[PDB]
């Protein structure tokens, strides 16, 4: 459904951002 397609989009984006923030965080710990 349009709703379920939207939920999927938002979860995929949210998790993608989290993973990228994690990588940014590990790099920040060594700066």
């Amino acid at each position: 459904s349009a709703a379920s397609d939207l939920d999927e989009l938002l979860w995929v984006i949210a998790v993608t951002i989290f993973g990228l923030v994690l990588i940014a965080s590990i790099l920040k710990f060594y700066k």
Side-chain angles (χ1 to χ4, degrees), residues 1-27 30:
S1 74
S4 69
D5 287 339
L6 177 55
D7 194 50
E8 178 191 320
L9 177 66
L10 300 179
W11 275 97
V12 171
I13 293 171
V15 172
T16 296
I17 293 179
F18 181 74
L20 295 166
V21 168
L22 265 180
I23 297 145
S25 279
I26 186 59
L27 294 167
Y30 291 110

